Amino acid sequence: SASKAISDISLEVDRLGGRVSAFEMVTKKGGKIAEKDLVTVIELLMNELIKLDAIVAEGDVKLQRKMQVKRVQNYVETLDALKVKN
Ligand SMILES: [Cl-]
């Protein structure tokens, strides 16, 4: 069930996105993020990217898969930018 299996990865991406948001706030408020934590989250996101680089769908479901892929790419992009700065 494509649509379902993606909405599932989507739930994990929601949670990982929350961690990204937490890292951003810490940084915004003058705090420091452990490099170890940045790598942990980036790598959990890459695992979701791998899971989504294998879900076959058609029609609007294919669009949902690409949207989740875009979400992950954006978060990794945000995390890479933070790592430079942490
Ligand atoms: Cl697809």
Question: In angstroms, what is the span from residue 2 Cα to ligand 1's centroid?
Answer: 9
Question: In angstroms, what is the span from residue 58 Cα to ligand 1's centroid?
Answer: 6
Please answer whether residues 4 and 53 qualify as being in contact, where contact means their C-beta atoms are separated by less than 8 angstroms. Answer: no
Please answer whether residues 75 and 21 qualify as being in contact, where contact means their C-beta atoms are separated by less than 8 angstroms. Answer: no
Q: Which of 21, 20, 17, 8 is nearest to 64 (CA)?
A: 8
- Separation in Å, CA 7 to CA 21, 44, 67: 20, 17, 11
Half-sphere exposure of 10 (CA within 13 A, CB side): 14
Q: Name the structure determination technique.
A: X-ray
For this entry, resolution in Å reads 1.8
Question: In angstroms, what is the span from residue 65 Cα to ligand 1's centroid?
Answer: 6
Q: Residue 8 sits in a domain of what CATH number? A: 1.20.58.120
> In 10 A of CB 17, how many CB atoms?
17
Please answer whether residues 73 and 48 qualify as being in contact, where contact means their C-beta atoms are separated by less than 8 angstroms. Answer: no
Looking at residue 58, what DSSP letter applies?
-
Residue 67: domain span: 1-86
Question: In angstroms, what is the span from residue 56 Cα to ligand 1's centroid?
Answer: 4
- Domain count of the fold of the chain: 1
Q: What angle do CA 46, 47, 51 make, to 5 degrees?
A: 115
Note the Cα 38 to chain centre separation in Å.
12
- Separation in Å, CA 56 to CA 8, 9, 37, 71, 84: 15, 14, 32, 18, 35
Question: In angstroms, what is the span from residue 57 Cα to ligand 1's centroid?
Answer: 4
Q: Which residues have CB under 8 Å from 10's CB, separation 6+?
A: 68, 71
